[PDB]
Subunit: 300 residues, 2 copies
């Protein structure tokens, strides 16, 4: 019976989110196919000791900790197969600037942009060429939209506090979607809506709250969406699964984000996207294991 390590780790929030991911997996893995080995990482490199007996690492990780590529690099070196994209692909997909460069070279639609450095200053020369308004995002991955001349400036200050690196994009307003890819096949598309929500007990107001529905899109747009989301997957060297976040504007989808390590809880987008296609959660984990195994073998 194949020993499946369920890998959890990170710090603070991400650790929480990782644990909640790991517990969902640990509960839904077929116990007849698998021997389940929950693994909780105190420190990242404690992974080598723990991984010493398991036959596969099913990554429950979330955030930079599972996206930077170290864990994948480490697992490769121990010769343990593991789920999801590899080190180079994880790393690239977590870098917004490098990602967009590889995307534009393929002529895949993504908003024009500019990169900004903590130490460096912005030559207004290249900046204002994309004009207004703008969105400022950290390069490694909140949102600040900037309408005016002075608008931009105020943000970089605090974004540079946190991220040594920032991307400034021209702001496209359109209809948001997310496209999960599993093993080169596009799963059902999900549309993301924003609606204001009031919480009486905490007395909280939120407009950033999300509503996600599976809606069949016009077959014309559905084609142009599936083309692009599979092109990203290919171009960024993703494997076994990925989530492409997109923005549709006047008929044309633009790539907003590429997630090599998307939410794996049952309310997460990719597990919903799959379920709509008739793949229930427990089987989803089977596919991730079997496709990951095959992919790792091709790699080496």
């Amino acid at each position: 019976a194949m020993r499946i390590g369920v890998i959890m780790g990170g710090v603070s929030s991400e650790k929480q989110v990782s644990i909640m991911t790991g517990n969902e997996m640990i509960a839904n893995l077929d116990k007849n196919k698998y021997e389940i080995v929950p693994i909780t990482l105190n420190e990242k490199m404690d992974l080598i000791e723990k991984a010493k007996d398991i036959d596969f690492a099913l990554l429950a990780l979330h955030g930079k900790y599972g996206e930077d590529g170290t864990v994948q690099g480490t697992l490769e070196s121990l010769g343990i197969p593991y789920s999801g994209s590899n080190m180079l692909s994880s790393g690239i997909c977590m870098d917004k600037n490098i990602s967009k460069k590889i995307l534009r070279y393929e002529g895949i639609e993504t908003p024009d942009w500019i990169e900004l450095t903590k130490m460096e200053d912005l030559n207004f020369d290249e900046l204002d060429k994309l004009g207004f308004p703008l969105v400022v995002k950290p390069n490694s991955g909140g949102v600040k939209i900037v309408y005016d001349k002075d608008e931009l400036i105020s943000m970089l200050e605090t974004v540079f506090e946190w991220d040594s690196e920032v991307v400034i994009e021209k702001y496209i307003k359109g209809e948001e979607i997310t496209c999960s890819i599993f093993d080169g096949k596009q799963l059902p598309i999900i549309s993301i809506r924003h609606a204001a929500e009031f919480f009486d007990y905490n007395a909280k107001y939120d407009d950033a709250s999300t509503i996600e529905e599976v809606i069949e899109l016009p077959a014309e747009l559905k084609e142009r969406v599936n083309k692009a989301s599979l092109a990203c997957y290919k171009a960024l060297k993703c494997s076994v699964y990925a989530r492409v976040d997109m923005m549709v504007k006047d008929g044309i989808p633009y790539v907003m984000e590429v997630n090599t390590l998307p939410g794996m809880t049952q309310a997460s987008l990719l597990p919903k996207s799959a379920d709509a296609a008739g793949i229930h959660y427990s089987k989803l984990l089977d596919m991730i294991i079997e496709t990951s195994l095959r992919v790792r073998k091709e790699e080496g």
Copy 2:
């Protein structure tokens, strides 16, 4: 004194190059500054234990083992500063196809290329837009299978089978006839440019003949070309996010430098190119090592 791990590792040939590199550094590290500890990895992940007590990791690695970025991501995650570029920058520079896509985006001259995978069959029409003759290189590089020129379609088909057992991906470029040069960057400054020419060599005892014989010299380039080479070389270093040092290999044709290779982990023995170049600049070997340490510490600090 700061404790400096000299990190050696790899398999087969690379590990020899590594041990050699690591022994030169050990012999030349300034012992008034540094308590010197050699570290020889039988397996890559032995690093976590073997590095527990060191203040800095000076990488003596060579080849993919120090290029793919596992070692850098590892040291990062342990909080031990290390020499040279970070995990992402190494990974990118080791990948020919991704590297060319990123340099091309900036309009840095590099020759046209096609990538082939062992799953996809190489349509010869997409490859005929290249034409002849062609250089075939494994996408992820390496010592094992080398870079090879192929003049016609048949010589190509062979060369593809030879590479594909060793590499999933292969990059195929227009060949450009020209003058070879190598440009070492140190901490964003250009060191003296090295010119490389070829001459056949006969070896009597082993009864061997080598027309692949290389001659490497530091010769002042005409001022214009030198300014054009120095612009391009630095733009490569910045575009691939390298740091503390890198070696950019270039082919000059009709006054135009083209990027052949970007190395985040070039040869560090005194007979290697980056050391010779630093030496032509009056930075001798022991000071080169201090510089790599000091600068790497500065960079790792900046990186959060």
